[PDB]
């Protein structure tokens, strides 16, 4: 009994953390910097803790509307260069992880390791990127988790939507915190005023 | 020679298969010791947190929601406070245990309620703290509360009192959306010498006992 | 009876499955012994390579980028040279260790710096070689450098000097795009007898120690 | 290296594969002891249930369908009742054993028939209960019934009688859509003292014996 209140049960359930959409007719690619802060319901559960550490399993559910479409999904790890164009050199780099997926095949899945240079992710961070009045404060300073990039490989009028399902695995969590009592206004910020 | 079976190629969002590492050869940063690891949410439920008993429109934007007034200038026949014991509803819903239970459909086990008197060392008073079981109906008077399960608490002698409400329902769990009432009554007037405040505040707290359990997780708009 | 699971039929570019040999019955040419096998790049990082310390627009197209001038005709209060210890930036970036670290996101461990004096056997001089930790700020004078970690090197007695800078950062690794400064100062004027060059050159070198490690590989346009 | 085979990816509605739990981490409510667990329907077939022997248009909307009239004012040469022993047809079809057998194509084993006399303690009578095997044809008289397998039942001495009809067919099973006849006859007139009802009722019951078996399940419009 009480395994359903284990941290693996509470934080380790798959959820749609991002919603990549793009069109084709540059243009035919999209990118998303990976964070758990986008969706309030996911964010609130992770923010019950000060630090968390997990590997993460990505599953990408794709729907498309105008032969079968071919997509490249690319994971760019922290501090590596992110694509600027649909056929940039970054898509060919053997240091990025790519999965090529073709329509009607089972949805693509991969696990990213815990990538951070610190031993856990900071859900909160009481410090700065530097000394300046312009310097960032809070959990945006730490926690580059990488970027998910999508392009169509096929030659040509179509709309593509990719739901990024994420499951945290082998989860550890430290220093419990009061639950968020008021609405989230912005990503990584503790600000609450409407 | 294999047959795929009707589940084959599904993305079931609750599945637990292995999957390929995107980055073999990469070794993650070593896990150092960090104080205060949490392994189960029931560790957090066991912490005493303040009940916002004083829910009135003047107090709910402030620290004053947590403090119950005790005073000389009062109708001593009226209830001091009452708390419904269901963690599903006000005032318990925004406590840490009410918040953690809101992520689950079902709860069970014992609740510890604690009361702390914050008057001067020269202030003395008796309060009657009564528990009324579910379905019995909230006491209308100090005499009716005294005929039930109760503590006569002398706040002069003891600055803190506690009550453990054990699990009492037909099923081993109940839904997170009665458990009875805790009610407080004046047993005496508020007694002080000269040059002492003729009023004080009391703080109410709640936590889980070691038997507490939550079941069937759910996500819902109880936070926007 | 099998179920495929959501990873099935992917081409994950980082996968490590078996695959069929295109040519069974073919036996590859026998592996003969060849000298100088490399098993790990950290073997290459441990080799001393010259630092292009003398980065000026007249010297960068030539052998002269590697040689620091030492001379009688100088302002003895000025720095001889300074090297930022970060292998991410000039002058260390084009050394073999800076180049190998540019294929990785993260680095850690100790750096060995070596200095070789190339004046005549009749030439003598003292240099003060100082290490300044990260965040302290580069010394403005020979006295300030002497108050820090330093060697007073007599190039007359010893033609070579070395400094090992150990790993000093809050995390076990740091990104490849401070570690402090190495600075060099005149302790004495340049001393020679008659019929001897009144100037000489010094060569600076860098390598990894046995503790050096690189992590999280990356490819980028630092070569076109 | 696998080959799928012609069954692969079917939904066969009678399959028995494993499948993923939609809710891992969820622990179902503990199974408490509940009295009266059923593991096999043959446990239910073994219960005696009333036969609606008196199927006439005046009685079929009422309790009277279960009771056979016995009386002084009768033609004593006529049958009291007859029951075809096939559970496929009236009157046996709506009994619990006829109903449970209607979910199956094939049945086998022994049937227990029981008869209970409900006249006064002062009422006495002999009945002849006869079993006629399949294919022999139903008896036309009490003498013909007496020449077959029968019981002469004195209802004055014994308020209950029973007959076990064993399995008798060429195949080990028979379809659920003969087994012979049970017939009842007056052996005597109905005898009573003064101030006693000159009629009574008899109740007929059926159940399976421990050898009973049902095979090849089917669903059909025998209930709409």
PDB file of C-alpha atoms in Angstrom, chain B residues 1-7 10 12 14-16 106 172-173 215-217, chain D residues 3-5 7-11 15 17 20-22 24 26-29:
ATOM      1  CA  UNK B   1       6.985 -16.973 -35.380  1.00  0.00           C
ATOM      2  CA  UNK B   2       4.975 -14.306 -33.529  1.00  0.00           C
ATOM      3  CA  UNK B   3       1.474 -12.779 -33.424  1.00  0.00           C
ATOM      4  CA  UNK B   4       1.158  -9.072 -32.547  1.00  0.00           C
ATOM      5  CA  UNK B   5      -2.090  -9.101 -30.386  1.00  0.00           C
ATOM      6  CA  UNK B   6      -4.702  -6.226 -30.165  1.00  0.00           C
ATOM      7  CA  UNK B   7      -2.549  -3.944 -27.915  1.00  0.00           C
ATOM      8  CA  UNK B  10      -0.575   1.607 -29.043  1.00  0.00           C
ATOM      9  CA  UNK B  12      -1.017   3.986 -23.890  1.00  0.00           C
ATOM     10  CA  UNK B  14       0.279   5.047 -18.642  1.00  0.00           C
ATOM     11  CA  UNK B  15       2.624   2.380 -20.178  1.00  0.00           C
ATOM     12  CA  UNK B  16       5.946   1.300 -18.558  1.00  0.00           C
ATOM     13  CA  UNK B 106      -9.719   8.759  -2.059  1.00  0.00           C
ATOM     14  CA  UNK B 172     -11.812   1.741   3.930  1.00  0.00           C
ATOM     15  CA  UNK B 173     -11.595   5.054   1.953  1.00  0.00           C
ATOM     16  CA  UNK B 215      -5.448   6.592  -3.485  1.00  0.00           C
ATOM     17  CA  UNK B 216      -6.460   7.079  -7.141  1.00  0.00           C
ATOM     18  CA  UNK B 217      -4.580  10.196  -8.326  1.00  0.00           C
TER      19      UNK B 217
ATOM     20  CA  UNK D   3       7.983 -13.899 -38.833  1.00  0.00           C
ATOM     21  CA  UNK D   4       4.488 -12.645 -37.923  1.00  0.00           C
ATOM     22  CA  UNK D   5       2.301 -15.664 -39.075  1.00  0.00           C
ATOM     23  CA  UNK D   7      -2.997 -14.811 -37.048  1.00  0.00           C
ATOM     24  CA  UNK D   8      -0.947 -11.604 -36.385  1.00  0.00           C
ATOM     25  CA  UNK D   9      -2.826  -8.393 -35.453  1.00  0.00           C
ATOM     26  CA  UNK D  10      -6.285 -10.098 -35.327  1.00  0.00           C
ATOM     27  CA  UNK D  11      -8.866  -9.147 -32.781  1.00  0.00           C
ATOM     28  CA  UNK D  15      -8.505 -14.473 -27.242  1.00  0.00           C
ATOM     29  CA  UNK D  17      -3.508 -12.511 -24.211  1.00  0.00           C
ATOM     30  CA  UNK D  20      -1.270  -3.364 -20.220  1.00  0.00           C
ATOM     31  CA  UNK D  21      -2.846  -2.045 -17.019  1.00  0.00           C
ATOM     32  CA  UNK D  22      -4.255   1.436 -17.706  1.00  0.00           C
ATOM     33  CA  UNK D  24      -0.176   1.061 -12.547  1.00  0.00           C
ATOM     34  CA  UNK D  26      -3.258   2.134  -8.295  1.00  0.00           C
ATOM     35  CA  UNK D  27      -3.950  -0.605  -5.714  1.00  0.00           C
ATOM     36  CA  UNK D  28      -7.585  -1.914  -5.858  1.00  0.00           C
ATOM     37  CA  UNK D  29      -9.761  -1.920  -2.703  1.00  0.00           C
TER      38      UNK D  29
END
